[PDB]
Amino acid sequence: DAWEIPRESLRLEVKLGQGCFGEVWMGTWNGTTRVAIKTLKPGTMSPEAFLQEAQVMKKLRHEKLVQLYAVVSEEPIYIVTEYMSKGSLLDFLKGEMGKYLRLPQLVDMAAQIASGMAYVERMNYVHRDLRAANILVGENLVCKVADFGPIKWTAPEAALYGRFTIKSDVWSFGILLTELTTKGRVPYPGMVNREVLDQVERGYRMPCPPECPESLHDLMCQCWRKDPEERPTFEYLQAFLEDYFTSTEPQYQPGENL
């Protein structure tokens, strides 16, 4: 396969953390290319199983999806992608950058993510695990969708009946909008998993975050409609967020946190 590279073309320089399946390093590819490198422990997945899973990353190509560069598909398995210099969106929001982010930046990040998901939508794929921990951030506030597949992010028909669709991703996107506007707080604060699913079935929805405009919370509520077919498309969500400060909140004024 043409995605295969030799093991000696990689250098793992800085350990970054724990990715969804293995550990992740910042490194160099072919001595010239800055890359992110993920290592899978030999016990985790067969080479046959891995090639089926990696097929998605080989299929999909979009500026807002983290881009696969190369693989070493024999154990021990290595996965090589573009390097996202700011790490996960969740860490980004919680960390030192959080306090400088205001609504225009956060809405712009949301628009990029929706753009990535609109591509996933047009390709008839489903993410199944959309949330800030699975979004990566680069230079210039670039955001990209990563780690294709957490009850608090999961639509009730998906959690209850296994109905994972692009519409359940739309629900998750609405929850991701609250992470953005709270600078990364856990959704449903003070509620454990068990309360959440029951509360949501009886119609409970998170309220408007402090300093978040009502019109953006209305968009969240559209994402959290009980009937999945009544939720907006990502194409709609992308356009709404890109146009937000002209068409929807032309009179926005900066606040203390948003």
Ligand SMILES: CC(C)c1nc(-c2ccc(NC(=O)Nc3cccc(C(F)(F)F)c3)c3ccccc23)c2c(N)nccn12
């Ligand atoms: C530790 C954090 C903050 C982080 N994770 C990734 C990161 C996300 C998603 C991937 N994609 C991935 O693991 N894809 C797949 C596809 C099919 C099968 C498998 C697996 F199951 F074999 F692992 C993984 C990565 C891959 C390879 C290397 C990295 C990453 C990155 C990054 N790219 N740049 C900066 C920081 N990063």
